[PDB]
């Protein structure tokens, strides 16, 4: 790895600089290098890893959606067929996206998840595993779409089981996991009723626990609660 000669602390320092510079491909490479040092990650470091790769894959997902839409339009009765280029370039972006997802899943499997024993770290990583299988599912078609969906579901479910046992219903890790699992149900798994039920129960149980929170924690929890509400408004 090209980051193998750099100090762990230097990699984290540069990841933060890259964040400030909006250089998210660099940020992701720095954080991959930090993970590959083999030590567990702190909360701040886990967040840097997530911010970096979410921004990278987010650009890829947006581009893939643009190209897929153009491709679908080109494949309609009455469209002047324009050769293989749209498909080729959509496939190029898709392969790069799948590569980023495989890289993140590889870091989780070797060996972030198995060394994560505290609930806050383990739930975070299992949610990430669900998320990156979900991004793979967004572009999957053939035989393996079913298996990718099941892998996402399994990771989210393990994370949910731990979060419900070990975290209060306002915990922002737990809330964002439930948010993303509800998105999985609506957008990937063709289960809008499950999505709505999960979003509603999550919201209501968090509402009832807000009285226990400080001002700052209340702001964190209610921000995610608003996203649950936004989706429920979209969905109903």
């Amino acid at each position: 790895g090209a980051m193998g000669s750099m100090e762990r602390a230097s990699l984290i320092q540069k990841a933060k600089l890259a964040e400030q510079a909006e250089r998210y491909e660099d940020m992701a490479a720095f954080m991959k290098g930090a993970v590959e040092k083999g030590e567990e990650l702190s909360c701040e470091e886990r967040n840097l890893l997530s911010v970096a790769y979410k921004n990278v894959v987010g650009g890829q997902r947006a581009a893939w959606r643009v190209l897929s839409s153009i491709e679908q339009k080109s494949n309609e009765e009455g469209s002047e067929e324009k050769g293989p280029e749209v498909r080729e370039y959509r496939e190029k972006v898709e392969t790069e996206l799948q590569g980023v997802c495989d890289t993140v899943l590889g870091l989780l499997d070797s060996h972030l998840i198995k060394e994560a024993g505290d609930a806050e770290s383990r739930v975070f990583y299992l949610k990430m595993k669900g998320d990156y299988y979900r991004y793979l599912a967004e572009v999957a078609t053939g035989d393996d779409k079913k298996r990718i969906i099941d892998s996402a579901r399994s990771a989210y479910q393990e994370a949910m089981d731990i979060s419900k046992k070990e975290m209060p219903p306002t915990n922002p890790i737990r809330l964002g996991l439930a948010l993303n699992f509800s998105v999985f149900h609506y957008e990937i798994a063709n289960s809008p009723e499950e999505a709505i039920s999960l979003a509603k129960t999550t919201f209501d149980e968090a509402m009832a626990d807000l009285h226990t929170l400080s001002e700052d924690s209340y702001k964190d929890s209610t921000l995610i609660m608003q996203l649950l509400r936004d989706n429920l408004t979209l969905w109903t």
């Binding site: 967040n47 911010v51 948010l179 993303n180 509800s182 998105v183 957008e187 969905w235």
Partner: peptide
Amino acid sequence: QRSTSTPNVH
């Protein structure tokens, strides 16, 4: 419009 997932938080 697509559903909203957890955003990044600096």
